[PDB]
Design a binder for this molecule. Structure first.
Ligand SMILES: NC(=O)c1ccc[n+]([C@@H]2O[C@H](COP(=O)([O-])OP(=O)(O)OC[C@H]3O[C@@H](n4cnc5c(N)ncnc54)[C@H](OP(=O)(O)O)[C@@H]3O)[C@@H](O)[C@H]2O)c1
Ligand SMILES: CN(Cc1cnc2nc(N)[nH]c(=O)c2n1)c1ccc(C(=O)N[C@@H](CCC(=O)O)C(=O)O)cc1
Ligand SMILES: [Mn+2]
Ligand SMILES: [Mn+2]
Ligand SMILES: [Mn+2]
Ligand SMILES: [Mn+2]
Length: 159
């Protein structure tokens, strides 16, 4: 099973200048909770944004070019990325925009954080078709001293 996980600001913005212009520790905790002990697939730009291997996860990087770090696994196509995960229950695709667009048709589950923040961005989550997805979990949180925007965690499953 392939899942996508992402945090989206208003208008589906997911990044700006290879970074994310919000700091929401509760959402990072959610990301860790839902990805630990699973393989994670990311594009090369997201690998450079994260800046180091994510511990406790098999890190698979998509790039057309040879890899430059043997602490992670480098693959050259979508099919190779999936195969490199082996026979696990759930593969997590962690972006960025180009990678989400290629894996969305293959995904059964979306883990989305909707952040109530107006962010100029240069990268968006794919338009997906709402009729294709059932919301199975949602949990809203007001802003607090640690998280400066309200946010909603949602899980959707392909109908
Ligand atoms: N809000 C969130 O949840 C979230 C999550 C992840 C990322 N982001 C943000 O997303 C932005 C980065 O996204 P992006 O769309 O620019 O880049 P991306 O999807 O991270 O990386 C694209 C790169 O991945 C490689 N790639 C993708 N598909 C491939 C394929 N089929 N075969 C081979 N290589 C492939 C290519 O590398 P080569 O050029 O080396 O061939 C391509 O240039 C940043 O702003 C980051 O902060 C946000
Ligand atoms: C840019 N990026 C890709 C990306 C994909 N999907 C996402 N989905 C959502 N919901 N929120 C995102 O921020 C998000 N980010 C990342 C991803 C992870 C990290 C990072 O440092 N993670 C640590 C933190 C553990 C903690 O603080 O509790 C860890 O996991 O151990 C940094 C940048
Ligand atoms: Mn092929
Ligand atoms: Mn197999
Ligand atoms: Mn806000
Ligand atoms: Mn599209």
């Amino acid at each position: 099973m392939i899942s996508l996980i992402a945090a989206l600001a208003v208008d589906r913005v997911i990044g700006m200048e290879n970074a994310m212009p919000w700091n929401l520790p509760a959402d990072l905790a959610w990301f860790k909770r839902n990805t630990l002990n699973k393989p994670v697939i990311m594009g090369r730009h997201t690998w450079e944004s994260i800046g180091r291997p994510l511990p406790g996860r098999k890190n698979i990087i998509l790039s057309s070019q040879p890899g430059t770090d043997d602490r992670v696994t480098w693959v050259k196509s979508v099919d190779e990325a999936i195969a490199a995960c082996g026979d696990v229950p759930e593969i997590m695709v962690i972006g960025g925009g180009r990678v989400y667009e290629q894996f969305l048709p293959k995904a059964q589950k979306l883990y989305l954080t909707h952040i109530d923040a107006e962010v100029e961005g240069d990268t968006h989550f794919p338009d997906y078709e709402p009729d294709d997805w059932e919301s199975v979990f949602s949990e809203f949180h007001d802003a607090d001293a640690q998280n400066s925007h309200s946010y909603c965690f949602e899980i959707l499953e392909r109908r």
